[PDB]
Design an enzyme around this catalytic site. Structure first.
Site, PDB file in Angstrom:
ATOM      1  N   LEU A  22      -2.600  17.211  11.658  1.00  0.00           N
ATOM      2  CA  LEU A  22      -1.878  18.066  10.712  1.00  0.00           C
ATOM      3  C   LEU A  22      -1.291  19.279  11.416  1.00  0.00           C
ATOM      4  O   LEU A  22      -1.448  19.428  12.627  1.00  0.00           O
ATOM      5  CB  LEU A  22      -2.798  18.510   9.567  1.00  0.00           C
ATOM      6  CG  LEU A  22      -3.359  17.452   8.607  1.00  0.00           C
ATOM      7  CD1 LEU A  22      -4.402  18.080   7.691  1.00  0.00           C
ATOM      8  CD2 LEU A  22      -2.265  16.766   7.788  1.00  0.00           C
ATOM      9  N   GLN A  23      -7.364  21.212  17.423  1.00  0.00           N
ATOM     10  CA  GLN A  23      -6.466  20.467  16.545  1.00  0.00           C
ATOM     11  C   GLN A  23      -7.084  20.223  15.164  1.00  0.00           C
ATOM     12  O   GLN A  23      -8.308  20.128  15.030  1.00  0.00           O
ATOM     13  CB  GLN A  23      -6.041  19.142  17.200  1.00  0.00           C
ATOM     14  CG  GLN A  23      -7.114  18.050  17.226  1.00  0.00           C
ATOM     15  CD  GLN A  23      -6.820  16.962  18.247  1.00  0.00           C
ATOM     16  OE1 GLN A  23      -7.024  17.151  19.450  1.00  0.00           O
ATOM     17  NE2 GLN A  23      -6.351  15.813  17.773  1.00  0.00           N
ATOM     18  N   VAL A  24      -6.229  20.132  14.146  1.00  0.00           N
ATOM     19  CA  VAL A  24      -6.674  19.931  12.765  1.00  0.00           C
ATOM     20  C   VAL A  24      -6.229  18.555  12.263  1.00  0.00           C
ATOM     21  O   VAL A  24      -5.039  18.238  12.276  1.00  0.00           O
ATOM     22  CB  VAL A  24      -6.144  21.036  11.812  1.00  0.00           C
ATOM     23  CG1 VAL A  24      -6.850  20.965  10.462  1.00  0.00           C
ATOM     24  CG2 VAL A  24      -6.319  22.424  12.423  1.00  0.00           C
ATOM     25  N   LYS A  44     -11.274  20.597  11.387  1.00  0.00           N
ATOM     26  CA  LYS A  44     -10.883  21.363  12.566  1.00  0.00           C
ATOM     27  C   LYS A  44     -11.818  20.982  13.703  1.00  0.00           C
ATOM     28  O   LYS A  44     -13.037  21.075  13.578  1.00  0.00           O
ATOM     29  CB  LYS A  44     -10.957  22.864  12.288  1.00  0.00           C
ATOM     30  CG  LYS A  44      -9.940  23.699  13.049  1.00  0.00           C
ATOM     31  CD  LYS A  44     -10.209  25.188  12.874  1.00  0.00           C
ATOM     32  CE  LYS A  44      -8.943  26.028  13.028  1.00  0.00           C
ATOM     33  NZ  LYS A  44      -8.136  26.084  11.765  1.00  0.00           N
ATOM     34  N   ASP A 154      -3.433  37.933  10.396  1.00  0.00           N
ATOM     35  CA  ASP A 154      -2.258  37.063  10.541  1.00  0.00           C
ATOM     36  C   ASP A 154      -1.810  36.478   9.194  1.00  0.00           C
ATOM     37  O   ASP A 154      -1.407  35.312   9.100  1.00  0.00           O
ATOM     38  CB  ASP A 154      -2.519  35.954  11.568  1.00  0.00           C
ATOM     39  CG  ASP A 154      -1.246  35.244  12.005  1.00  0.00           C
ATOM     40  OD1 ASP A 154      -0.132  35.775  11.783  1.00  0.00           O
ATOM     41  OD2 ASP A 154      -1.365  34.145  12.585  1.00  0.00           O
TER      42      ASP A 154
HETATM   43  C1  LIG Z   1     -10.203  22.517   8.495  1.00  0.00           C
HETATM   44  C2  LIG Z   1     -10.076  24.045   8.476  1.00  0.00           C
HETATM   45  C3  LIG Z   1     -11.165  24.824   8.877  1.00  0.00           C
HETATM   46  C4  LIG Z   1     -11.084  26.218   8.871  1.00  0.00           C
HETATM   47  C5  LIG Z   1      -9.902  26.842   8.465  1.00  0.00           C
HETATM   48  C6  LIG Z   1      -9.728  28.371   8.436  1.00  0.00           C
HETATM   49  O1  LIG Z   1      -8.877  28.875   7.707  1.00  0.00           O
HETATM   50  N1  LIG Z   1     -10.519  29.088   9.234  1.00  0.00           N
HETATM   51  C7  LIG Z   1     -10.443  30.557   9.305  1.00  0.00           C
HETATM   52  C8  LIG Z   1     -11.125  31.190   8.096  1.00  0.00           C
HETATM   53  C9  LIG Z   1     -10.509  32.562   7.835  1.00  0.00           C
HETATM   54  C10 LIG Z   1     -11.619  33.613   7.827  1.00  0.00           C
HETATM   55  C11 LIG Z   1     -11.238  34.525   6.667  1.00  0.00           C
HETATM   56  C12 LIG Z   1     -10.749  33.537   5.615  1.00  0.00           C
HETATM   57  C13 LIG Z   1      -9.869  32.596   6.433  1.00  0.00           C
HETATM   58  C14 LIG Z   1      -8.819  26.058   8.072  1.00  0.00           C
HETATM   59  C15 LIG Z   1      -8.898  24.672   8.062  1.00  0.00           C
HETATM   60  C16 LIG Z   1      -7.648  23.907   7.637  1.00  0.00           C
HETATM   61  O2  LIG Z   1      -6.714  23.825   8.431  1.00  0.00           O
HETATM   62  N2  LIG Z   1      -7.648  23.374   6.412  1.00  0.00           N
HETATM   63  C17 LIG Z   1      -6.608  22.678   5.910  1.00  0.00           C
HETATM   64  C18 LIG Z   1      -5.454  22.417   6.655  1.00  0.00           C
HETATM   65  C19 LIG Z   1      -4.416  21.698   6.079  1.00  0.00           C
HETATM   66  C20 LIG Z   1      -4.554  21.253   4.766  1.00  0.00           C
HETATM   67  N3  LIG Z   1      -3.571  20.558   4.201  1.00  0.00           N
HETATM   68  N4  LIG Z   1      -5.671  21.517   4.066  1.00  0.00           N
HETATM   69  C21 LIG Z   1      -6.673  22.204   4.598  1.00  0.00           C
END
Ligand SMILES: Cc1ccc(C(=O)NCCC2CCCC2)cc1C(=O)Nc1ccc(N)nc1
Length: 285
Positions: A22, A23-24, A44, A154
């Site tokens: 979508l 590495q993810v 992720k 960000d």
């Molecule tokens: C799998 C995953 C794990 C962790 C995160 C993520 O945002 N991590 C950082 C967390 C931050 C800390 C403060 C709140 C946001 C995102 C993802 C992600 O990319 N999710 C995702 C990606 C694409 C789609 N379509 N749906 C969900």
């Protein structure tokens, strides 16, 4: 430094079937919820042979997600693979529609400020309600994050994901275009610099996924004018109050910018006003 409760969060690796990147990666999780046997998820994943500190980086990202807890508007964590025997993996929900920037971009030819009879003429159209709603939802999620001493650092449309029933989630995947003056010149990151970025996010929402600062070269001349008070002009899909909210978020003095609590309050009011207005629009025609 935060804890990892494996009993609650750990998920077996061979219970996942990894799909397309979508590495993810997108994947099928088997038995991750009480509710379903199979569920689509996002994973992720650390690349093979990656650095020790790159491991810790992803580990903290997982621990932060655990610590903050559940909010509808911040990408929901479902589990993790952390134990030896395979790569470190962090598992969230799958937001069907992807990042908000791209989605708004696809909706350019499918926008009306508001709907009237016959409504089927604007099936799946974006309205002002949608746009103000997305902003309200991100604000609530940011108020939640600010409440916990988090700093996204960000915040942008590319980092907003869209699910069913117009629910948006804050996540984290040129960046200068979202950075506050003090973040650029002093290298300072605060709750209030996140408020600056939110203003730029607002501009993205009410331009339907346009790239901020259109046409402008992003050099040292760009930075000077930002410090001196030059701001983007109102985007094509904005309401006057919305653009002023963008101007409020872009205050030169970080302490003069509204808080996320104030933004939640204000946009909630803008969402209700718009709804009432639409009720009259709908009822009269
Ligand atoms: C799998 C995953 C794990 C962790 C995160 C993520 O945002 N991590 C950082 C967390 C931050 C800390 C403060 C709140 C946001 C995102 C993802 C992600 O990319 N999710 C995702 C990606 C694409 C789609 N379509 N749906 C969900």
């Amino acid at each position: 430094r935060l804890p990892y409760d494996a009993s609650k969060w750990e998920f077996p690796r061979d219970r996942l079937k990894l799909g397309k990147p979508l590495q993810v990666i997108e994947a099928d999780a088997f038995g991750i919820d009480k509710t379903a046997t199979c569920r689509t998820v996002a994973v992720k994943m650390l690349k093979e042979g990656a650095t020790h500190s790159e491991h810790r980086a992803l580990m903290s990202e997982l621990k932060i997600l655990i610590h903050i807890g559940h909010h509808l508007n911040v990408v929901n964590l479902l589990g993790a693979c952390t134990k030896p025997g395979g790569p470190l993996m962090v598992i969230t929900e799958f937001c069907k529609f992807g990042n908000l920037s791209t989605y708004l971009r696809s909706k350019r030819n499918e926008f009306v400020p508001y709907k009237v009879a016959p409504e089927d003429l604007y099936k799946d159209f974006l309205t002002l309600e949608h746009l103000i709603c997305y902003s309200f939802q991100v604000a609530k999620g940011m108020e939640f994050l600010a409440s916990r001493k988090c700093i996204h650092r960000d915040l942008a449309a590319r980092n907003i994901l869209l699910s069913e029933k117009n629910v948006v989630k804050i996540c984290d995947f040129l960046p200068l275009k979202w950075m506050a003056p003090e973040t650029i010149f002093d290298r300072v990151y605060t709750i209030q610099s996140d408020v600056w970025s939110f203003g730029v996010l607002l501009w993205e929402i009410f331009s339907l996924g346009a790239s901020p600062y259109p046409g402008v070269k992003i050099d040292e001349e760009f930075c000077r004018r930002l410090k001196e008070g030059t701001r983007m002009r109102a985007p094509d899909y904005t309401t006057p109050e919305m653009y002023q909210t963008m101007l409020d978020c872009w205050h030169g003095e970080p302490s003069q910018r509204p808080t996320f609590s104030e933004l939640v309050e204000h946009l909630g009011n803008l969402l209700q006003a718009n709804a009432q207005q639409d009720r009259h629009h709908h009822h009269h025609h």
